[PDB]
Amino acid sequence: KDKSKELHAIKERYLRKFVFEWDASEDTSIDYNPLYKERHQVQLLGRGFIAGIDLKQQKREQSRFYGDLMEKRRTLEEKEQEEARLRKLRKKEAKQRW
């Protein structure tokens, strides 16, 4: 299908009635090119926080590549500090959920 998609794309390149709301026939995002269709989300190496996206969900939805790399690169003291910080964060989260 992708080969035929490129084929007809190149062919195209070279060769009152009131409405309640918008219609889906005007969508333009449909691109067969998998690189363009599937664009790598810019997570900013664990620093990408979209506005409307839920913070907890975004942390869950994060690829954790940056987090895993930081955990590997963190020293023993850095690991201890991170563990303490996450323990305090978990205690705070328990306080809010209470």
Partner 1 sequence: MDFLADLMDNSELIRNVTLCGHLHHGKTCFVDCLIEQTHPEIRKRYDQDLCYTDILFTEQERGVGIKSTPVTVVLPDTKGKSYLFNIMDTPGHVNFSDEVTAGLRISDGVVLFIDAAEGVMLNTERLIKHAVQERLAVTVCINKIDRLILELKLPPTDAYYKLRHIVDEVNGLISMYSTDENLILSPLLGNVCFSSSQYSICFTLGSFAKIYADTFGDINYQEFAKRLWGDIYFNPKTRKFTKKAPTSSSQRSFVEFILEPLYKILAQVVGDVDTSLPRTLDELGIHLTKEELKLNIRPLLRLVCKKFFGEFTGFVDMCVQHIPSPKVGAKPKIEHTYTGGVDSDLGEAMSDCDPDGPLMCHTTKMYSTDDGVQFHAFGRVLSGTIHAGQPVKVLGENYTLEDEEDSQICTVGRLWISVARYHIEVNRVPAGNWVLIEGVDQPIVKTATITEPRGNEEAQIFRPLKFNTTSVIKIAVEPVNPSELPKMLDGLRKVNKSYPSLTTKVEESGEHVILGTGELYLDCVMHDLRKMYSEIDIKVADPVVTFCETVVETSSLKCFAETPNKKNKITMIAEPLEKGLAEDIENEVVQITWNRKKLGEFFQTKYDWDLLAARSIWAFGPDATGPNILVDDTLPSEVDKALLGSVKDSIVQGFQWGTREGPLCDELIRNVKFKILDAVVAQEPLHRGGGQIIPTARRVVYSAFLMATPRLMEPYYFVEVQAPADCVSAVYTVLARRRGHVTQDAPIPGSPLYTIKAFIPAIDSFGFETDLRTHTQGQAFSLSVFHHWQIVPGDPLDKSIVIRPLEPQPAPHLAREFMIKTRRRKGLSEDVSISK
Partner 2 sequence: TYQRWQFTLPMMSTLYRLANQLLTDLVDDNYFYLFDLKAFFTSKALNMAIPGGPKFEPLVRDINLQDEDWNEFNDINKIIIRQPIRTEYKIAFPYLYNNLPHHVHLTWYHTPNVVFIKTEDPDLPAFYFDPLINPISHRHSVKSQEPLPDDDEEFELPEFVEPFLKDTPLYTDNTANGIALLWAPRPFNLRSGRTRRALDIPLVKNWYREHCPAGQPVKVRVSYQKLLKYYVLNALKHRPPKAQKKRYLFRSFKATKFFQSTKLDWVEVGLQVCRQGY
Partner 3 sequence: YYRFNTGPVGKGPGCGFWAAGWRVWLFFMRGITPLLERWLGNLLARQF
Question: Binding residues for partner 3, per CB under 8 A?
Answer: 51-54, 56-57
Q: Does 19 contact partner 2 by CB under 8 A? A: no
Minimum Å gap between C-beta 42 and partner 1 is 4
- Residues 18, 20, 22, 98: which binds partner 2 (CB under 8 A)? 22
Site mask, partner 2, residues 36-75, x = CB under 8 A?
A: x--x-xx-xxxxxxxxx--x----------x--xx--xx-
Pair 41, 48: CB distance under 8 Å: yes
Asked if 81 is part of the footprint of partner 1 (rule: CB under 8 A), the reply reads no
Looking at residue 54, its amino acid is D
Question: Rounded to the nearest whole angstrom, what is the least distance from the CB of residue 69 to partner 3 in the complex?
Answer: 25
